[PDB]
Amino acid sequence: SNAASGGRALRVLVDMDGVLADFEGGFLRKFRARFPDQPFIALEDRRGFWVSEQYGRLRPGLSEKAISIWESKNFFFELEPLPGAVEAVKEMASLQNTDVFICTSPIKMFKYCPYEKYAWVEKYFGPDFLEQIVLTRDKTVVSADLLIDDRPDITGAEPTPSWEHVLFTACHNQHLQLQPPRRRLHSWADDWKAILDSKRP
Amino acid sequence: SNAASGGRALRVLVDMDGVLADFEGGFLRKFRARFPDQPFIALEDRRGFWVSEQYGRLRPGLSEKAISIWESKNFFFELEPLPGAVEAVKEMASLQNTDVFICTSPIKMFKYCPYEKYAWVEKYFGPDFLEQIVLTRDKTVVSADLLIDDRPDITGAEPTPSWEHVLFTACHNQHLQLQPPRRRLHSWADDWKAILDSKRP
Ligand SMILES: Cc1cn([C@H]2C[C@H]3O[C@](c4ccc(I)cc4)(P(=O)(O)O)OC[C@H]3O2)c(=O)[nH]c1=O
Ligand SMILES: Cc1cn([C@H]2C[C@H]3O[C@](c4ccc(I)cc4)(P(=O)(O)O)OC[C@H]3O2)c(=O)[nH]c1=O
Numbered sequence A, B: 001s002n003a004a005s006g007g008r009a010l011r012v013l014v015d016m017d018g019v020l021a022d023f024e025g026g027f028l029r030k031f032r033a034r035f036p037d038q039p040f041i042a043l044e045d046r047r048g049f050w051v052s053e054q055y056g057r058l059r060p061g062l063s064e065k066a067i068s069i070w071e072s073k074n075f076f077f078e079l080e081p082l083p084g085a086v087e088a089v090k091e092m093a094s095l096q097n098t099d100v101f102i103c104t105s106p107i108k109m110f111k112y113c114p115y116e117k118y119a120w121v122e123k124y125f126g127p128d129f130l131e132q133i134v135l136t137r138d139k140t141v142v143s144a145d146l147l148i149d150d151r152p153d154i155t156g157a158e159p160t161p162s163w164e165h166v167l168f169t170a171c172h173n174q175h176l177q178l179q180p181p182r183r184r185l186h187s188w189a190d191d192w193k194a195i196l197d198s199k200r201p
């Protein structure tokens, strides 16, 4: 909830794909369904952030097939929420002196993706939560105290972002050793409130 | 253009509606076309930021008719660029040590608007410029040196935004007296480079 007028609430940016919405599991399900005769990558075997790069190493042409999954209508809209994500963000947004924004990057093909990201937020958090969405390719220009995001290295135009990046565990980053003092949130079952409280005055 | 790796480019947020895209003129044209039997507000007579509030004072029910214009498919997409806007932003983006983002707020009804804002940017600035778009209801959480925006009072979750707000003149704000030392850009013919240079070290 917002701080009193003029006051300064803790500000938390919560990523969408891989944090709120199960991009990797959705991707694999639809890839298997659409391309049953191709090899796939089990979630346990995912390595590197970019799904299509691993698929391309698997077999010539599989990268383009992978891309066609997320370019398709209803791919973003039909992603399942991660366990605990909706409940946690609803709780988080209800906390005193706490402003939560959902901060997400749309893909390059923009016909469906931005629209469906709005629709997905509406479906799970309600119409009033649409006020909290920020779409950007560059999260470094968004100022906050915390950014909870599955992408290990987040860089952009601002060489010194204001947020602390808390790495949200995902199949593709779960084996990564991080530079101290970088922190992880394992899942939404993990103690996200402690992380927030550690940033409060 | 981006600063050298690690370096810090001047960062300019450029608003879309009323700065790049002629929302007010588009609105009036389509309102007149759709509702030829209703009274309208000449651009010279626009007062207050919110178009629908003035229309509602004009006649009971006109507010809802006004809203239906911008909720319609192709309203955002078919807006004409303001004179000089495309040329200026292209020049601006080519300047050394200068990062330009188009920062826009989508309307509440999200079926068309975000999509069409991406499409409009693609149409006028090209596909690579899509990397520069930030969609947000709250521009105070976007960090930059400058925000060129027609809306007179821009507030939100960050009580002390990092940008200087330069008011871009529009039919609805052209008579407003501003608090010193607040600055205006009259139009894209006006000397926007001087404004930028005044923020450079
Ligand atoms: C968010 C995300 C996206 N992707 C896919 C989606 C598509 O997203 C992108 C992408 C998405 C956002 C950014 I910033 C940069 C690149 P595309 O360039 O827009 O198509 O990168 C190539 C593709 O990789 C992934 O494989 N894993 C992810 O976690
Ligand atoms: C950008 C802009 C929007 N509007 C119209 C558009 C629609 O935009 C909104 C609007 C848009 C952005 C914000 I932040 C807050 C409100 P809507 O609540 O999304 O429908 O406000 C009511 C309407 O007013 C205007 O009348 N003038 C403007 O310059």
Ligand SMILES: [Mg+2]
Binding pocket: A015, A016, A017, A018, A019, A149, A150, A151
């Ligand atoms: Mg992510």
Ligand SMILES: [Mg+2]
Binding pocket: B015, B016, B017, B018, B019, B149, B150, B151
């Ligand atoms: Mg505007």
